[PDB]
Amino acid sequence: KPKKLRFHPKQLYFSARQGELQKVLLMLVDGIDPNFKMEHQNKRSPLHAAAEAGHVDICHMLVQAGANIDTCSEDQRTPLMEAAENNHLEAVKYLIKAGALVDPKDAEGSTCLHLAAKKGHYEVVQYLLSNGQMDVNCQDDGGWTPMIWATEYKHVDLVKLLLSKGSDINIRDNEENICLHWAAFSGCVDIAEILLAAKCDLHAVNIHGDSPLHIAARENRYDCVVLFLSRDSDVTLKNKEGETPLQCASLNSQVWSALQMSKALQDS
């Protein structure tokens, strides 16, 4: 039973993280369980660290040793999600081609597609939609789609990629917002333009009665406000509290100056 060269269980996780291929090889040969879970470190397996860092050589060695490709951390994350969120395409490709499940959702109901969309990783999203049977309109616990996340973080070519692969411009979230309300929130005039060309309703309202113009004025997104005014968005429409988009704007601001002008000019 006594071994001259002894390893600590935690050493396999950190060596997978650092991409020390020869150290992982030696530990796996010494019969260290590749399916170990880090107790005081969000119950993650070394396959999570190897995937998070993008080490395809290490990832493969762990799977060949017998690691579970679909292991979950405390926050119900899979290594496929860790590689997708940290933009490691060849690790994403390795895990999908090994048999990693694309379908799992984390604690927030996010899939690897949501997590790569959120961060603007075009390359990963492109692979997940092409060499994957992944739902373009999957919704998380807020009822948000990968497009909504991509829109909010202003990832224009990513929104365009999802649009071209069947993303529905009319999906409603749990607060009754469509993607256009999030383009108005983020202040993305490029995305807001693309959605309007796709003949999106400029007067769609959420659970608060807010039109994209209410949201753009509140978030002080002048460029969006101007786009919506040029598309003849209603300056009079009152939300649920009874406020017009002008009543949502910041006092003595560029948005305020434009909205107070539009109101006086439409009067007659």
UniProtKB/Swiss-Prot annotation:
Region annotated Histone H3K9me binding, chain positions: 175-177
The keyword ATP-binding is assigned to this record: no
ANK repeats: 7-36, 42-71, 75-104, 108-138, 142-171, 175-204, 208-237, 241-268
Disulfide bonds: none
Tissue: Widely expressed.
Coarse class of the protein's main subcellular location: nucleus
GO biological process: chromatin organization; DNA methylation-dependent constitutive heterochromatin formation; epigenetic regulation of gene expression; facultative heterochromatin formation; negative regulation of DNA-templated transcription; negative regulation of transcription by RNA polymerase II; peptidyl-lysine dimethylation; peptidyl-lysine monomethylation
Effect of E175A: Abolishes binding to histone H3K9me
Keyword annotations: Acetylation, ANK repeat, Chromatin regulator, Chromosome, Disease variant, Intellectual disability, Isopeptide bond, Metal-binding, Methyltransferase, Nucleus, Phosphoprotein, Repeat, S-adenosyl-L-methionine, Transferase, Ubl conjugation, Zinc
GO CC terms of this entry: chromatin; nuclear body; nucleoplasm; nucleus
Subcellular localization(s) per the UniProt record: Nucleus; Chromosome
Single GO MF descriptor: methyltransferase activity
Position(s), cross-link Glycyl lysine isopeptide (Lys-Gly) (interchain with G-Cter in SUMO2): K1
Source superkingdom: Eukaryota
Clinical note on disease: Kleefstra syndrome 1: A form of Kleefstra syndrome, an autosomal dominant disease characterized by variable intellectual disability, psychomotor developmental delay, seizures, behavioral abnormalities, and facial dysmorphisms. KLEFS1 patients additionally manifest brachy(micro)cephaly, congenital heart defects, and urogenital defects.
Free-text domain note: The ANK repeats recognize and bind RELA subunit of NF-kappa-B, when RELA is monomethylated at 'Lys-310'. They also specifically recognize and bind H3K9me1 and H3K9me2. The SET domain mediates interaction with WIZ.
Biological role stated in the UniProt entry: Histone methyltransferase that specifically mono- and dimethylates 'Lys-9' of histone H3 (H3K9me1 and H3K9me2, respectively) in euchromatin. H3K9me represents a specific tag for epigenetic transcriptional repression by recruiting HP1 proteins to methylated histones. Also weakly methylates 'Lys-27' of histone H3 (H3K27me). Also required for DNA methylation, the histone methyltransferase activity is not required for DNA methylation, suggesting that these 2 activities function independently. Probably targeted to histone H3 by different DNA-binding proteins like E2F6, MGA, MAX and/or DP1.
Family: Belongs to the class V-like SAM-binding methyltransferase superfamily.
UniProt subunit comment: Heterodimer; heterodimerizes with EHMT2. Interacts with WIZ and EHMT2. Part of the E2F6.com-1 complex in G0 phase composed of E2F6, MGA, MAX, TFDP1, CBX3, BAT8, EHMT1, RING1, RNF2, MBLR, L3MBTL2 and YAF2. Interacts (via ANK repeats) with RELA (when monomethylated at 'Lys-310'). Interacts with MPHOSPH8. Interacts with CDYL. Interacts with REST only in the presence of CDYL. Part of a complex containing at least CDYL, REST, WIZ, SETB1, EHMT1 and EHMT2. Interacts with BAZ2B.
This protein's name: Histone-lysine N-methyltransferase EHMT1
